[PDB]
Amino acid sequence: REKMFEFYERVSGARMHAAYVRPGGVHQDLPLGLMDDIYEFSKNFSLRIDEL
Amino acid sequence: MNLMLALLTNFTLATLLVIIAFWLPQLNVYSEKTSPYECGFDPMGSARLPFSMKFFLVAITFLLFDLEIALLLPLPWASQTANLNTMLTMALFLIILLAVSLAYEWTQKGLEWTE
Amino acid sequence: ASATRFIQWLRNWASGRDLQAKLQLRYQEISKRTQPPPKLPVGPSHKLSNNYYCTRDGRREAMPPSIVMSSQKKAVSPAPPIKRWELSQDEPYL
Amino acid sequence: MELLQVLKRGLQQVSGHGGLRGYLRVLFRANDVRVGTLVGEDKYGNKYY
Amino acid sequence: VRETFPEATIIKPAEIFGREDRFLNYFANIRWFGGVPLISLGKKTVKQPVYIVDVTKGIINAIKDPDARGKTFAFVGPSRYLLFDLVQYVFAVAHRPFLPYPLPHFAYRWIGRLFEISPFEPWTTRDKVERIHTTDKILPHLPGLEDLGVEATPLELKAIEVLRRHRTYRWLSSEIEDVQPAKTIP
Amino acid sequence: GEYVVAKLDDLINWARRSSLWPMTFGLACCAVEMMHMAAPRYDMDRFGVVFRASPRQSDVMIVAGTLTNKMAPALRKVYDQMPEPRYVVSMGSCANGGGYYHYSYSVVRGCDRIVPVDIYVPGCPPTAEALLYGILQLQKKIKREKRLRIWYRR
Amino acid sequence: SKVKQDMPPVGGYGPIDYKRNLPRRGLSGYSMFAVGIGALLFGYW
Amino acid sequence: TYKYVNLREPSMDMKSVTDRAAQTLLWTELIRGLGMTLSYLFREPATINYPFEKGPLSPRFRGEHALRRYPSGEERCIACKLCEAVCPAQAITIEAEPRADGSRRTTRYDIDMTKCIYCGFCQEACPVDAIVEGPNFEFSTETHEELLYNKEKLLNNGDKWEAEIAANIQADYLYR
Amino acid sequence: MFMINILMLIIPILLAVAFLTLVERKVLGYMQLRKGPNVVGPYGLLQPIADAIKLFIKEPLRPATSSASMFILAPIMALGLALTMWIPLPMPYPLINMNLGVLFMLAMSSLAVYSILWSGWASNSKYALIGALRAVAQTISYEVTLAIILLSVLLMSGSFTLSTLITTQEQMWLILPAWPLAMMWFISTLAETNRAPFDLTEGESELVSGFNVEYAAGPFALFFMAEYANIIMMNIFTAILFLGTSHNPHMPELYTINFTIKSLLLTMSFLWIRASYPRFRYDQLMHLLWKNFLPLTLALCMWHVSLPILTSGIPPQT
Amino acid sequence: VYDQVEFDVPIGSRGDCYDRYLCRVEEMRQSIRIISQCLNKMPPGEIKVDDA
Ligand SMILES: CCCCCCCCCCCCCCCCCC(=O)OC[C@H](COP(=O)([O-])OCC[N+](C)(C)C)OC(=O)CCCCCCCCCCCCCCCCC
Ligand SMILES: CCCCCCCCCCCCCCCCCC(=O)OC[C@H](COP(=O)(O)OCCN)OC(=O)CCCCCCCCCCCCCCCCC
Ligand SMILES: CCCCCCCCCCCCO[C@@H]1O[C@H](CO)[C@@H](O[C@H]2O[C@H](CO)[C@@H](O)[C@H](O)[C@H]2O)[C@H](O)[C@H]1O
Ligand SMILES: CCCCCCCCCCCCO[C@@H]1O[C@H](CO)[C@@H](O[C@H]2O[C@H](CO)[C@@H](O)[C@H](O)[C@H]2O)[C@H](O)[C@H]1O
Ligand code: SF4
Numbered sequence A: 001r002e003k004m005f006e007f008y009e010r011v012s013g014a015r016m017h018a019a020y021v022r023p024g025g026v027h028q029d030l031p032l033g034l035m036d037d038i039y040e041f042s043k044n045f046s047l048r049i050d051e052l
Numbered sequence B: 001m002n003l004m005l006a007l008l009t010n011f012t013l014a015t016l017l018v019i020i021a022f023w024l025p026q027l028n029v030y031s032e033k034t035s036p037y038e039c040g041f042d043p044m045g046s047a048r049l050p051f052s053m054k055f056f057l058v059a060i061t062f063l064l065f066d067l068e069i070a071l072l073l074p075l076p077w078a079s080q081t082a083n084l085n086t087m088l089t090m091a092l093f094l095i096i097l098l099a100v101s102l103a104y105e106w107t108q109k110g111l112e113w114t115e
Numbered sequence C: 001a002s003a004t005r006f007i008q009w010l011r012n013w014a015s016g017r018d019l020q021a022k023l024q025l026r027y028q029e030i031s032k033r034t035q036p037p038p039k040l041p042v043g044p045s046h047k048l049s050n051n052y053y054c055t056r057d058g059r060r061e062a063m064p065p066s067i068v069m070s071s072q073k074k075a076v077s078p079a080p081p082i083k084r085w086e087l088s089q090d091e092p093y094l
Numbered sequence D: 001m002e003l004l005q006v007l008k009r010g011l012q013q014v015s016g017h018g019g020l021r022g023y024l025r026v027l028f029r030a031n032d033v034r035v036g037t038l039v040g041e042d043k044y045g046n047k048y049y
Numbered sequence E: 001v002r003e004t005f006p007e008a009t010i011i012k013p014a015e016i017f018g019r020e021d022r023f024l025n026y027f028a029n030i031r032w033f034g035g036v037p038l039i040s041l042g043k044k045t046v047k048q049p050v051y052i053v054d055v056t057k058g059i060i061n062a063i064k065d066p067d068a069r070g071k072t073f074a075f076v077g078p079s080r081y082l083l084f085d086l087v088q089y090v091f092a093v094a095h096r097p098f099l100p101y102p103l104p105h106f107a108y109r110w111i112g113r114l115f116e117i118s119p120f121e122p123w124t125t126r127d128k129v130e131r132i133h134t135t136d137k138i139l140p141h142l143p144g145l146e147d148l149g150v151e152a153t154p155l156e157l158k159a160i161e162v163l164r165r166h167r168t169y170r171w172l173s174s175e176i177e178d179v180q181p182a183k184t185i186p
Numbered sequence F: 001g002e003y004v005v006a007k008l009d010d011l012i013n014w015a016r017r018s019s020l021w022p023m024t025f026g027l028a029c030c031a032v033e034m035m036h037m038a039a040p041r042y043d044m045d046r047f048g049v050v051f052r053a054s055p056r057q058s059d060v061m062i063v064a065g066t067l068t069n070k071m072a073p074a075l076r077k078v079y080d081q082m083p084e085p086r087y088v089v090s091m092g093s094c095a096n097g098g099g100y101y102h103y104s105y106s107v108v109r110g111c112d113r114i115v116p117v118d119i120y121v122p123g124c125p126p127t128a129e130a131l132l133y134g135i136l137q138l139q140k141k142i143k144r145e146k147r148l149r150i151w152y153r154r
Numbered sequence G: 001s002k003v004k005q006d007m008p009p010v011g012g013y014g015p016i017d018y019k020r021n022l023p024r025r026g027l028s029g030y031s032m033f034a035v036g037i038g039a040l041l042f043g044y045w
Numbered sequence H: 001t002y003k004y005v006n007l008r009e010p011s012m013d014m015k016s017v018t019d020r021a022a023q024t025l026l027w028t029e030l031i032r033g034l035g036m037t038l039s040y041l042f043r044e045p046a047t048i049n050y051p052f053e054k055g056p057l058s059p060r061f062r063g064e065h066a067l068r069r070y071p072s073g074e075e076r077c078i079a080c081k082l083c084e085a086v087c088p089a090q091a092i093t094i095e096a097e098p099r100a101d102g103s104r105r106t107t108r109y110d111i112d113m114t115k116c117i118y119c120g121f122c123q124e125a126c127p128v129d130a131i132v133e134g135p136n137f138e139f140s141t142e143t144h145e146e147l148l149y150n151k152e153k154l155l156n157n158g159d160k161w162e163a164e165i166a167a168n169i170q171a172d173y174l175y176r
Numbered sequence I: 001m002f003m004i005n006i007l008m009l010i011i012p013i014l015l016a017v018a019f020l021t022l023v024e025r026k027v028l029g030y031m032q033l034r035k036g037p038n039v040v041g042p043y044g045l046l047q048p049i050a051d052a053i054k055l056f057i058k059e060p061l062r063p064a065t066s067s068a069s070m071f072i073l074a075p076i077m078a079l080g081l082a083l084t085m086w087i088p089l090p091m092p093y094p095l096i097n098m099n100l101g102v103l104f105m106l107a108m109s110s111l112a113v114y115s116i117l118w119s120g121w122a123s124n125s126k127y128a129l130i131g132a133l134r135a136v137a138q139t140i141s142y143e144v145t146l147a148i149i150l151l152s153v154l155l156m157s158g159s160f161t162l163s164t165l166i167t168t169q170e171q172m173w174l175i176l177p178a179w180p181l182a183m184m185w186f187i188s189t190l191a192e193t194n195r196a197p198f199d200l201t202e203g204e205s206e207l208v209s210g211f212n213v214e215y216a217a218g219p220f221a222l223f224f225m226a227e228y229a230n231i232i233m234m235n236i237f238t239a240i241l242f243l244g245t246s247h248n249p250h251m252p253e254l255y256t257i258n259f260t261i262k263s264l265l266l267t268m269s270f271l272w273i274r275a276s277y278p279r280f281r282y283d284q285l286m287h288l289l290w291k292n293f294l295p296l297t298l299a300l301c302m303w304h305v306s307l308p309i310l311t312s313g314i315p316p317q318t
Numbered sequence J: 001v002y003d004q005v006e007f008d009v010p011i012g013s014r015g016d017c018y019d020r021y022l023c024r025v026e027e028m029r030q031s032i033r034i035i036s037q038c039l040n041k042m043p044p045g046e047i048k049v050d051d052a
């Protein structure tokens, strides 16, 4: 959850109350290199579900 | 003596710690601080009201089972008897009757808690 | 990442997985914290001609509700019945 | 053996901090004894690693 | 204070009772020693205790009242009691067993001197003994609470507010009416 | 005299700030960032900060979220039921001063109308790190207490 | 200059696991029970 | 499509039955669970060493507010009041008048930081980049009154943090 | 020289208990991917001292509705009886050498239950009462099974003397001939010490704090100290009962070293189990003992009565 | 764009706490499955409606 808060904070500047999704689209574009980091997180997450 | 000395020291130390705990700290006592706790809202009724026991039948059976141990605890000494033929029969007899009593209560739903 | 081979072996055996391939601590596989500047694209309405706003005004094409009945032949349902879902071929039974 | 090589990094930490006295200072001030590259120092004396 | 600040309002309260007072709480705490020692069995002292909120309202009204300057006020309660009646009433409202017994003046300074040895807040002192047994003065020439718009509160309305915490569980829920008022000095 | 009580303050202060047990008490959003301070990245437990559910076994109340009028009597109750010394940390805009519900008919405009507050942590919510900064600021407040020094000079 | 924004790599990303993987481990019930009774008999002896 | 999470009938062959009897009696699946927490015991913990180590943030982070200047030292704020109008929390209070040189400038600029929701709308609305949310998140105070910022406080914040504020704006303004 | 011996027993116990709390917080920390105390003293070594000082300068509370005498009596029994459980332990020499040390510990452990009942009752609050009656339920669950489990083991030792268990296990640990009993004994000690997954009388997530929810400061500390002293004592007893350490009369310290390591590891396993499992429902604890352990314990009791006779392996009375 | 991703809906059979627990865990796995598609099929273009 802490690493996913970093995705919230990187697109919006806030960990929780992003205010990012708005009527008409989103507030800002994804910063360069974010989708790589989201892929890195997602590559390993299923293993965490397995430990759970 | 040694045992009495040991017991007195144990409960003397415990009492000294309680005494220190009560007279060392600075106290500020008022009604709200000492009111009964119940998650922030006042208790609804007395905590001395009856509290139903759902395992009451198991609790009585414990009294009868809890006396089987007194009858069985002498077994290590009984194993030193010359008359081992009689021993083993009577030791096995008691445990089986205890097992049968347990089976009876089990099959008759005596171990199920009342709703 | 600094754990010794014996400890790597031990926590692999205890967990029953290869924990090293998918570490939960991030090292240098993450993006650099200084990135080059972007150059973001513009939208469809960034034209110098054939772009009158009155041809692309969604708010002005909204209309009041259609009065079907006002108190001032076959039976129908609100929509066709929903189709029955099919079982997954990816993994039908978890 | 690995266990010996692990125990040699514990002693490099002691010297890497300038002796036992320097090792204890960071241990009690920061609760950490890792030795890192000095990246810079600011005008107030903070050191960055 | 009178010469230094001639236009100062001076307020002279009787003993004040309230949740955090050293008056009703004081008597209620004597239970920890068994009986309640009193000089001359509390039959020689008269008290006119005044409620804390009465004093506070009187102070606040003096600030705003232009005629309170250079005056001296006596803030006293509405009823005068014999000490013995007061302390007996304190134990009735707290529902604690009351075992009064006389203690001469000299011997009960000895106890006061023994409590003064605490480096902390003394439980009682010789001076505390003197004050508790001092008869409250009657000063008709000074204006009172009534002259500052305050209507004095009887000890009976607010005693339970202070003394309920001193009861055991068995008596925590007794209402205000369960204890008859102390006898007053008319 | 002065030297002994000076050291004794240092000792009781050190023990109290090194063993801070917050009440298990959260109200709304900000309680989520309070969880993240207990989570591995920040690990409040490593500072000696341990949640305990009972008010009797708690030293700090962290007001983490909006305080409504309906909740206000309950919050005051569990605060009063903490033994002393006790501290209150006001976390987030709602607790600090009503925040984004400041003008609501059902919200208390700041928890300091109900309890005394030692530390105010700003944010909506404050990051987990910002709350940790507030807890460590509360520790340094406790490090400066002069209970025995003042007692000695009474 | 050409448009630059966060995009996937040209080939796409590598496969991402998601299905449950709880591997099988241990010995048969017979083997486990046999080891236990073997332990008991040596203990009694 | 859909899948079943719990709809499997266990096999009833004496080997499978004996396997489950061993599981019931030898606690094998509870032992297996002990293996997992044992493995974690020998993993490096994720804890950082705050305040000597900090958590990672981005140039978009929404922290403490500050009023900015132009390179000359003139204030950017021109008392347009767009930030005050958009503020969802009504946390901004502004008064303005002509300055002694005729400039359009504020005489009051308050942010009630206990009303603010740190949403960043004010810095979106500002047409001159006057009001921003800087990177500072470590400004907890001991009193409520210390969190009611006036113009002098916010201008000092701008001068205090301008070196970092400018670098963050430089890294993200092309996404705006 | 006996008073000195008593202090050499109970003062170290209180120190071991203090640092067990630190070790628990660290071990659970690392199993939870964090660190646990490492600021207050190096590696958190001063944390137990800070917690101890803080509690004993915290204000104690007497709840308004509480029964005063039983409220104060209950924590004194808890710590007093917890320390009494150590006087017969052969380490390798007991402080008090009892003929019936095994039965003495059974009696004291039964008496220590009342420190829960009376603290919960005297508190006169509902959460305290609910916790107290869970203690009644928990004792009913394990007491009958616990005694008969011990009896089966003592049929191979031939005595109720704790020191005779050392002699019985001179050639081999009793866990070999009795691992089914060691399994049920180990579970019974978790239930007996109110330890997770059987931490029901306190049960944080259900009862706030259960039987001692109204206790603060020093009186609370006594309950906490008693719990952790009982954790260590019951694992020492488990080590003596099933993992007998050879005793050399001329080098008794070597016994104490090996014996201590086994007890530490068994205590560590209590922390390990706490980090791994959810909590039982307290009627499911009763059924576990009565419907599973009890039928098997009764059968193994008959087996261990017969086995010495049929193998001609009856031990001596001495 | 939920009509353009593939995922399965977990379904319980006993309507109890355990089945809802298993449904939620399997929903996390399907979320990762969707996230993998969003990462690969992210299109270029503007982020808010081109209507000022
Ligand atoms: C495992 C066992 C662990 C036991 C650990 C025990 C603690 C060890 C560390 C002791 C250090 C000293 C602690 C002092 C804390 C006092 C509480 C406090 O802070 O109050 C502030 C008070 C100051 O209060 P004050 O006078 O400034 O004002 C109080 C009034 N109000 C609230 C309005 C402000 O300190 C004192 O009153 C005196 C300080 C005494 C310090 C020396 C201790 C002597 C106490 C003896 C009491 C007499 C009864 C005997 C009790 C038995 C004693 C062994
Ligand atoms: C030559 C002739 C020989 C004659 C003798 C032969 C005897 C050999 C065969 C005897 C049987 C061996 C097993 C004996 C142990 C007791 C087994 C047992 O009771 O398990 C069942 C019990 C309940 O499980 P459950 O499935 O929920 O209930 C049945 C469903 N109706 O399961 C449980 O107890 C659940 C326990 C939950 C709590 C576990 C927490 C701790 C787990 C880790 C501990 C690991 C073991 C540590 C042992 C320490 C020893 C020092
Ligand atoms: C519902 C009621 C249930 C009642 C169940 C009672 C079960 C009792 C089963 C019999 C138990 C004893 O069984 C009996 O034990 C003794 C040993 O002590 C054996 O006796 C054998 O050993 C003894 C001494 O050990 C020798 O003196 C003897 O020469 C030899 O025969 C018997 O050969 C055996 O038959
Ligand atoms: C000599 C010592 C060793 C011998 C064993 C002695 C104890 C024997 C215990 C009784 C065994 C038979 O009696 C018992 O009766 C109940 C009827 O409610 C049966 O059936 C019941 O048991 C289980 C668990 O409670 C339930 O899941 C089931 O729904 C219910 O039908 C049990 O399957 C059976 O085990
Ligand atoms: S301060 Fe913000 S995050 Fe905290 S409860 Fe209020 S709105 Fe939610």
Ligand code: SF4
Pocket: H083, H086, H087, H088, H089, H090, H091, H092, H111, H115, H116, H117, H118, H119, H120, H121, H122, H123, H133
């Ligand atoms: S961040 Fe949002 S709530 Fe705070 S001042 Fe700016 S617009 Fe108002």
Ligand code: SF4
Pocket: H076, H077, H078, H079, H080, H081, H082, H083, H084, H094, H122, H125, H126, H127, H128, H129, H130, H131
């Ligand atoms: S800060 Fe910006 S938006 Fe607000 S009044 Fe000044 S110029 Fe306008």
